[PDB]
Scaffold this active site. Structure first.
Site, PDB file in Angstrom:
ATOM      1  N   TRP B  80       0.784  -1.241   0.000  1.00 50.34           N
ATOM      2  CA  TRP B  80       0.000   0.000   0.000  1.00 50.34           C
ATOM      3  C   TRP B  80       0.831   1.315   0.000  1.00 50.34           C
ATOM      4  O   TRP B  80       0.252   2.428  -0.278  1.00 50.34           O
ATOM      5  CB  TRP B  80      -1.082   0.023   1.130  1.00 50.34           C
ATOM      6  CG  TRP B  80      -1.962  -1.209   1.176  1.00 50.34           C
ATOM      7  CD1 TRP B  80      -1.850  -2.257   2.048  1.00 50.34           C
ATOM      8  CD2 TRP B  80      -3.044  -1.548   0.277  1.00 50.34           C
ATOM      9  NE1 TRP B  80      -2.796  -3.233   1.761  1.00 50.34           N
ATOM     10  CE2 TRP B  80      -3.547  -2.818   0.686  1.00 50.34           C
ATOM     11  CE3 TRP B  80      -3.658  -0.892  -0.791  1.00 50.34           C
ATOM     12  CZ2 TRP B  80      -4.637  -3.437   0.051  1.00 50.34           C
ATOM     13  CZ3 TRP B  80      -4.759  -1.495  -1.428  1.00 50.34           C
ATOM     14  CH2 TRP B  80      -5.231  -2.763  -1.019  1.00 50.34           C
ATOM     15  N   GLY B 114      -6.835   5.755   1.225  1.00 52.08           N
ATOM     16  CA  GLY B 114      -5.636   6.002   2.035  1.00 52.08           C
ATOM     17  C   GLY B 114      -5.950   7.093   3.035  1.00 52.08           C
ATOM     18  O   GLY B 114      -5.078   7.856   3.404  1.00 52.08           O
ATOM     19  N   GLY B 115      -7.210   7.259   3.439  1.00 50.67           N
ATOM     20  CA  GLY B 115      -7.477   8.137   4.603  1.00 50.67           C
ATOM     21  C   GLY B 115      -7.452   9.622   4.213  1.00 50.67           C
ATOM     22  O   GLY B 115      -7.438  10.503   5.107  1.00 50.67           O
ATOM     23  N   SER B 196     -12.705   3.046   0.093  1.00 54.34           N
ATOM     24  CA  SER B 196     -12.373   3.740   1.382  1.00 54.34           C
ATOM     25  C   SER B 196     -12.462   5.244   1.172  1.00 54.34           C
ATOM     26  O   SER B 196     -13.504   5.691   0.710  1.00 54.34           O
ATOM     27  CB  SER B 196     -11.024   3.263   1.953  1.00 54.34           C
ATOM     28  OG  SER B 196     -10.966   3.509   3.346  1.00 54.34           O
ATOM     29  N   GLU B 323     -14.064  -5.640   7.661  1.00 53.98           N
ATOM     30  CA  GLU B 323     -13.457  -4.293   7.542  1.00 53.98           C
ATOM     31  C   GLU B 323     -12.515  -3.859   8.702  1.00 53.98           C
ATOM     32  O   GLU B 323     -11.433  -3.312   8.468  1.00 53.98           O
ATOM     33  CB  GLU B 323     -14.609  -3.269   7.477  1.00 53.98           C
ATOM     34  CG  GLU B 323     -15.519  -3.428   6.235  1.00 53.98           C
ATOM     35  CD  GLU B 323     -14.804  -2.987   4.966  1.00 53.98           C
ATOM     36  OE1 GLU B 323     -13.651  -2.494   5.043  1.00 53.98           O
ATOM     37  OE2 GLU B 323     -15.405  -3.080   3.888  1.00 53.98           O
ATOM     38  N   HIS B 436     -10.330  -5.393   4.996  1.00 53.21           N
ATOM     39  CA  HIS B 436     -10.493  -4.105   4.308  1.00 53.21           C
ATOM     40  C   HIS B 436      -9.431  -3.951   3.214  1.00 53.21           C
ATOM     41  O   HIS B 436      -8.247  -4.154   3.521  1.00 53.21           O
ATOM     42  CB  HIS B 436     -10.227  -3.008   5.317  1.00 53.21           C
ATOM     43  CG  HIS B 436     -10.304  -1.634   4.732  1.00 53.21           C
ATOM     44  ND1 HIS B 436     -11.514  -1.011   4.429  1.00 53.21           N
ATOM     45  CD2 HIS B 436      -9.324  -0.773   4.363  1.00 53.21           C
ATOM     46  CE1 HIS B 436     -11.262   0.205   3.970  1.00 53.21           C
ATOM     47  NE2 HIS B 436      -9.945   0.364   3.898  1.00 53.21           N
TER      48      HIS B 436
END
Ligand SMILES: *[C@@H]1O[C@H](CO)[C@@H](O[C@@H]2O[C@H](CO)[C@@H](O)[C@H](O)[C@H]2NC(C)=O)[C@H](O)[C@H]1NC(C)=O
Ligand SMILES: *[C@@H]1O[C@H](CO)[C@@H](O[C@@H]2O[C@H](CO)[C@@H](O)[C@H](O)[C@H]2NC(C)=O)[C@H](O)[C@H]1NC(C)=O
Ligand SMILES: CC(=O)N[C@@H]1[C@@H](O)[C@H](O)[C@@H](CO)O[C@H]1O
Ligand SMILES: CC(=O)N[C@@H]1[C@@H](O)[C@H](O)[C@@H](CO)O[C@H]1O
Ligand SMILES: CC(=O)N[C@@H]1[C@@H](O)[C@H](O)[C@@H](CO)O[C@H]1O
Ligand SMILES: CC(=O)N[C@@H]1[C@@H](O)[C@H](O)[C@@H](CO)O[C@H]1O
Ligand SMILES: CC(=O)N[C@@H]1[C@@H](O)[C@H](O)[C@@H](CO)O[C@H]1O
Ligand SMILES: CC(=O)N[C@@H]1[C@@H](O)[C@H](O)[C@@H](CO)O[C@H]1O
Ligand SMILES: CC(=O)N[C@@H]1[C@@H](O)[C@H](O)[C@@H](CO)O[C@H]1O
Ligand SMILES: CC(=O)N[C@@H]1[C@@H](O)[C@H](O)[C@@H](CO)O[C@H]1O
Ligand SMILES: *[C@@H]1O[C@H](CO)[C@@H](O)[C@H](O)[C@H]1NC(C)=O
Ligand SMILES: *[C@@H]1O[C@H](CO)[C@@H](O)[C@H](O)[C@H]1NC(C)=O
Ligand SMILES: *[C@@H]1O[C@H](CO)[C@@H](O)[C@H](O)[C@H]1NC(C)=O
Ligand SMILES: *[C@@H]1O[C@H](CO)[C@@H](O)[C@H](O)[C@H]1NC(C)=O
Ligand SMILES: C[C@@H]1O[C@@H](O)[C@@H](O)[C@H](O)[C@@H]1O
Ligand SMILES: C[C@@H]1O[C@@H](O)[C@@H](O)[C@H](O)[C@@H]1O
Ligand SMILES: C[C@@H]1O[C@@H](O)[C@@H](O)[C@H](O)[C@@H]1O
Ligand SMILES: C[C@@H]1O[C@@H](O)[C@@H](O)[C@H](O)[C@@H]1O
Ligand SMILES: [Ca+2]
Ligand SMILES: [Ca+2]
Ligand SMILES: [Cl-]
Ligand SMILES: [Cl-]
Ligand SMILES: [Cl-]
Ligand SMILES: [Cl-]
Ligand SMILES: [K+]
Ligand code: NA
Ligand code: NA
EC number: 3.1.1.8
Lengths: 527, 527
Positions: B80, B114-115, B196, B323, B436
């Site tokens: 990631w 990625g938030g 996400s 998740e 997730h």
């Protein structure tokens, strides 16, 4: 000392301790003249009556029957063998009542399975003491005649009219109508429940005019009369009766003479010849079973079902996730309870021969085609699982679902369950999955006994099943209302909701085995 | 040699071989002025235009960002992390087109998660070549700014107005409107998909007036803007911008002076201070994310959702069965990716502190109460599973379901999936289940590559997902129509049907997490 006055005389029960409380058990009450001598093969005759006190403190004789000897010493098969002496003198029943005596309790009447060739009410997994203790219902169970002694048919001839064991069951329902109030029971709130051939019996009482006023509602566990093993045609039935005569040396010209001769045979000679009245059997063969007799059953049952001719009432119907697997080790090549039974395509093919002996080559290729389009991995267990599913879908699950659609199309509420929990104690191996017959110990509440090596999750699952069966019997609605349980929807054609019973999470699902049942229900019958 | 004339000039792609066919890849096309110097923190500015041929034959710079260093050398976390140089010069996009050039192909535009603090379009699991090959769609993906560089907000001040990375995404959609026909694409048939934070972005484009005419429909994988990590309030956003100034030595009196100072800082000084702009974080902290800016977002998004103010079109929404589990090993005590993480009641309690740092004691006891009424066995994994479910239900699954109810109440068709297959190759341990982010490789068709150690069952599952996503993009209806697949029903409030995606059997189920979501949706917000 607990003595009850019945219509035919006094009976004495015994007190049992069950979970810090008491149940009164009346075991082995007679309900008909013993069917011996000139009464062999005839309808049960009503009980004379006795003076003094009849002692109902032990299980009675089980009816004559062949025994399963495929796995001597193995508890998985042997738990289904009779655990009382066999005798033609076997028309008795059991009553379990709560203590103290209830005032107007619902009554649950158990009818055992065994192919209409075997079975007995005294088996440990049918002990009614737990239900009586915990739900305060009264539980009744009866022995009824099986095999040729219960189902031999020369249709229209009252010396051997057919369906005698179904009339045995009926006469026991009549006994409960006339006698159960004395035991604190409500004759107006009787539910029949049964598994396999017992479930097919329950479905035929829904169809029999003479049974209509003898009960209120019905529960069918893995069985219904439209299953392909459940009803013999007049033609095969006469043929079987005559083959039996050939083998026992009783061929005569006059039919009543045939029966007279058959009544002189020792029961063993009759039992020994039963397997051979048929040119090829399968492990599900029912050599002597229900027939259209013009008496119990007035017409072909599929016609009555389709045209709405049956008792209008609620039903609870269900099946186990792996019905067909238990049968594969009674003759399919390459199967063993003692290994993982990974079979080839050729073995699968031969297995269809074992299970569909009268069927054309095309009929069998059509089964192979419907069941062997793999998804898709090259998993070695493909053929093993396909055979179990073939046998469970044809024999149990699709007939149960179709009974349930047709019955509910006439306006009554129906509830359908899919049982998918494999007992932690099952002695059969893991590949056999959630077997045929292994919900019964949950319905009777055996895992409620902590002493007994079931897990906690299993105790809780059984407790919830017992409450849903009891609420169904008392109230017509199999809900568990206190513990935020999943609400159980009625099964309607169109949506076809059913409830899954398991230890993890209980689910509402739709259209069980939809593609498979389309095959067995709309195509296979044409073959 | 494949050269396409765009509005801003010529670009050269490269040819790839994919499953015996060819795809043309244009990697690293710029779509905005690089946002440097006086452009840091401002909306992206439109591209000047070039002469000569721009070479789009390699992935571009990823945007500046902090990196995950919790598991150095471990592929499960490291896959990631960005796999191109980080740079403020990162506003580029990728185009994959079938060969031969299509005539009017549907376009799928990927927005990574990625938030809103991390992520890049160049990751292996977002490679669009397989979709272009197999479904003949065109796939586009863009880099957009993240962290303070993308989301710093002094609301109303155009030097740092907030939502810059969402405007980056918008400007890339505009590029596809003006340019995709040259590549054989249909600007009238564009579907956004994202996972996400990428899914929350897609949901905010459904809400932004300026995005309405830049796409046709939307796919939301484990994310929606009503998730509690997805939108920062004006109050916390100003506070964060000011805390960032304190830490970098840029506190000033004039706000525009603050930003001017912030533009002199090296990107590292800004990235190093991001974690601390907040008094306590959790592993799901989004320190700098979407805000109500009066521009991209005209009002609080929950109000727009509730009052029906959003683009009317079909949506496809879904979540993964576990998740919350990936997050437990970034700070909950007693968890480890390297053991089975059986935790105590006290550890569960401390974990709630990690995940619900601002919440009252009552708020946290209410979570413990809702999630620890065991059913019922004394299973040691109780507390471990409960924590994963707490974190997945609050952060992903209940917000996704609630977005989906509210959106479909205004008349549009919605489809909801529950992904429950754990990849055979997952490097994370087994207790983490169906994690997730681990549907993404199925959506992009990676298991279609036989060379690649996925099972057959997985290839088939991916192939069917790819077809359903493509049919959804092209036709608005995610069916797989040729292979007797389970028909995917629309999600309506009331019935709430959803589809399960798995390797064994695909099912229609109802009311996902009904009891849990009642807790998070109707009670927890009051706390
Ligand atoms: C499991 O056990 C069965 C039952 O015996 C094995 O089946 C036999 O396999 C042989 C070859 O050795 C056949 O020729 C026999 O006729 C089978 N016997 C019977 C009585 O059916 C089977 O091969 C074993 N499978 C395993 C170990 O996977
Ligand atoms: C699995 O690994 C975790 C992660 O280390 C262990 O958690 C530690 O347990 C100790 C007691 O030795 C605590 O005091 C530590 O603070 C924990 N460490 C961290 C870094 O959180 C856990 O005990 C292990 N669980 C097992 C083997 O079941
Ligand atoms: C043998 C019989 O017919 N009846 C007996 C009865 O005589 C006896 O007193 C009683 C006490 O247990 O049990 C029963
Ligand atoms: C299957 C059937 O309907 N009838 C069978 C037939 O095969 C057999 O040969 C004959 C004598 O056994 O009668 C019986
Ligand atoms: C149709 C026929 O022949 N029936 C006779 C029957 O009348 C007689 O009672 C019986 C017993 O001997 O034998 C037979
Ligand atoms: C039509 C007919 O009478 N068939 C049967 C035959 O199937 C069987 O093999 C034999 C007994 O061995 O008896 C005869
Ligand atoms: C370096 C550059 O700007 N463009 C190059 C071009 O000069 C070259 O001839 C071509 C062939 O691979 O690749 C590209
Ligand atoms: C959580 C919040 O809303 N604001 C925080 C507050 O706790 C903190 O002490 C102050 C300076 O750091 O501003 C920030
Ligand atoms: C509100 C305010 O004080 N604004 C000023 C602005 O006019 C000026 O351009 C900037 C740059 O020096 O400094 C600040
Ligand atoms: C209200 C307020 O200003 N609070 C914060 C406090 O939470 C924090 O501990 C400190 C930095 O160490 O800065 C100050
Ligand atoms: C038992 O209940 C029925 C109705 O279900 C009633 O008619 C009957 O007389 C009751 N008998 C009692 C309480 O003894
Ligand atoms: C209801 O739940 C309690 C535990 O909370 C249990 O003791 C009881 O057996 C349950 N009752 C039924 C009918 O399932
Ligand atoms: C592509 O399809 C659209 C409608 O979806 C049409 O209006 C457009 O002009 C088409 N362009 C082509 C075939 O070049
Ligand atoms: C349909 O099924 C065949 C195998 O029978 C397979 O090759 C193909 O990939 C399937 N297509 C889709 C879209 O799932
Ligand atoms: C008498 C009967 O004749 C025929 C055979 O196929 C049967 O097995 C039976 O023996
Ligand atoms: C388990 C199997 O059982 C049967 C026998 O024919 C085989 O030898 C094998 O051992
Ligand atoms: C400047 C800010 O002040 C307050 C603290 O709680 C934060 O961690 C931050 O450092
Ligand atoms: C697996 C765990 O990881 C962490 C360490 O604190 C422990 O020692 C343990 O080895
Ligand atoms: Ca058992
Ligand atoms: Ca992976
Ligand atoms: Cl073949
Ligand atoms: Cl359905
Ligand atoms: Cl406590
Ligand atoms: Cl429902
Ligand atoms: K056919
Ligand atoms: Na024995
Ligand atoms: Na690294």
């Amino acid at each position: 000392d607990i003595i009850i006055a019945t219509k035919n005389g006094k009976v004495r029960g015994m007190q049992l301790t069950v979970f810090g409380g008491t149940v009164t058990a009346f075991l082995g009450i007679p309900y008909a003249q013993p069917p011996l001598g000139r009464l062999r093969f005839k309808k049960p005759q009503s009980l004379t009556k006795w003076s003094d006190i009849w002692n109902a403190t032990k299980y009675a004789n089980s009816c004559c029957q062949n025994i399963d000897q495929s796995f001597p010493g193995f508890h998985g098969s042997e738990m289904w063998n009779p655990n009382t002496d066999l005798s033609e003198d076997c028309l008795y029943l059991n009553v379990w009542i709560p203590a103290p005596k209830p005032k107007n309790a619902t009554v649950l009447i158990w009818i055992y399975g065994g192919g209409f060739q075997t079975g007995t009410s005294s088996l440990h997994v049918y002990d009614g003491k737990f239900l009586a203790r915990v739900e305060r219902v009264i539980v009744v169970s009866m022995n009824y005649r099986v095999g040729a002694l219960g189902f031999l048919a020369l249709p229209g001839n009252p010396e051997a009219p057919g369906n005698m064991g179904l009339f045995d069951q009926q006469l026991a329902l009549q006994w409960v109508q006339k006698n159960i109030a004395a035991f604190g029971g409500n004759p107006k709130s009787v539910t029949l429940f049964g598994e396999s051939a017992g479930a097919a019996s329950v479905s035929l009482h829904l169809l029999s005019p003479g049974s209509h006023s003898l009960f209120t509602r019905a529960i069918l566990q893995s069985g219904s009369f439209n299953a392909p093993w459940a009803v013999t045609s007049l033609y095969e039935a006469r043929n079987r009766t005559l083959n039996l005569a050939k083998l026992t040396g009783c061929s005569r010209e006059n039919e009543t003479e045939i029966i007279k001769c058959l009544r002189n045979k020792d029961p063993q000679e009759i039992l020994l010849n039963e397997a051979f009245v048929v040119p090829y059997g399968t492990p599900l063969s029912v050599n002597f079973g229900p027939t259209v007799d013009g008496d119990f059953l007035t017409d072909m049952p599929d016609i009555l079902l389709e045209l709405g001719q049956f008792k209008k009432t609620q039903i609870l119907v269900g099946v186990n996730k792996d019905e067909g697997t238990a049968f594969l080790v009674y003759g399919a090549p390459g199967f063993s309870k003692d290994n993982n039974s990974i079979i080839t395509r050729k073995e699968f093919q031969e297995g269809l021969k074992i299970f569909f002996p009268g069927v054309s080559e095309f009929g069998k290729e059509s089964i192979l085609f419907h069941y062997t389009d793999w998804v898709d991995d090259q998993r070695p267990e493909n053929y093993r699982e396909a055979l179990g599913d073939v046998v469970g879908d044809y024999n149990f699950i699709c007939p149960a679902l179709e009974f349930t659609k047709k019955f509910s199309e006439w306006g009554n509420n129906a509830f359908f369950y899919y049982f998918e929990h494999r007992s932690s104690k099952l002695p059969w191996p893991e590949w056999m999955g959630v077997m045929h017959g292994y919900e019964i110990e949950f319905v009777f509440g055996l895992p409620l006994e902590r002493r007994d090596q079931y897990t906690k999750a299993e105790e809780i699952l059984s407790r919830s099943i017992v409450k849903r069966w009891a609420n169904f019997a008392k109230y017509g609605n199999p809900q568990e209302t206190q513990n935020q349980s999943t609400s159980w929807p009625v099964f309607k054609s169109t949506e076809q909701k059913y409830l899954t019973l398991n230890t993890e999470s209980t689910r509402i699902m739709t259209k069980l085995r939809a593609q498979q049942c389309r095959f067995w229900t709309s195509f296979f019958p044409k073959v």
